[PDB]
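Lecture 7, part B: from sequences to assemblies.

Below are the input chains for today's worked example.
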Amino acid sequence: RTFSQKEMAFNILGLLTPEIVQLCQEEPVMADLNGGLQFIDNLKDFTSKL
Amino acid sequence: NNPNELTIHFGGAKGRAIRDNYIGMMFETILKSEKIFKDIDETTTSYTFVSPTGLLSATQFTQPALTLMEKAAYEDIKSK
Amino acid sequence: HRIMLTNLLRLLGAVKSKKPTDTRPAQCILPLSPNHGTFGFDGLYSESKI
Amino acid sequence: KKTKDGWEYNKKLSSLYLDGLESAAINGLTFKDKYVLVTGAGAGSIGAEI
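Predicted structure of the full complex, as structure tokens:
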């Protein structure tokens, strides 16, 4: 899937939650907000094809 | 400095330990066990002390400061 | 690249230098990318993101 | 070898590289007609031995 600016902002603002804040305090947080794009083989070629 | 305001922050492990100290502080009376800092809990990230003109006049900070100035003067006197 | 990486690290370092307190960390929301060079001609964008 | 995501150890490529190393160890390695540009090859460095 592909996000809107509002959706991405909601995701990051949730990443600014108190729970993720303390999580970052105790341990660096890697938040994959990619909408499943990592599972596409040859993303550049597929994008150019589309 | 005698700051008018002073915010203690509870971020990181040291912050959690300090918050635990503040939470464990209890005002036992006759047996009731009301907490000194009722507004501090596990979900609080900070606590602010409030004074009208300066925190050095506050009882919690005045007493340690005065006890300590007297102790330090007496210990320098002892060293002499 | 300077904007995206070097001055970013300098901003974080300046905040750290300004903080003598150790109990109020600043949460740095790094805009990481899932695509480090897989897409086409982007200059040093992928370099900075990785 | 790069999988459909990241880089993981590969048996075939590793065996090829180690076989090349074995060949270089026994018979030596010719670099004739190889035009190289090496930097950071001062005395007491890996580049100097290269």
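Note for the exam: The radius of gyration of chain C is 14 Å. Keep this in mind when comparing with the next example.
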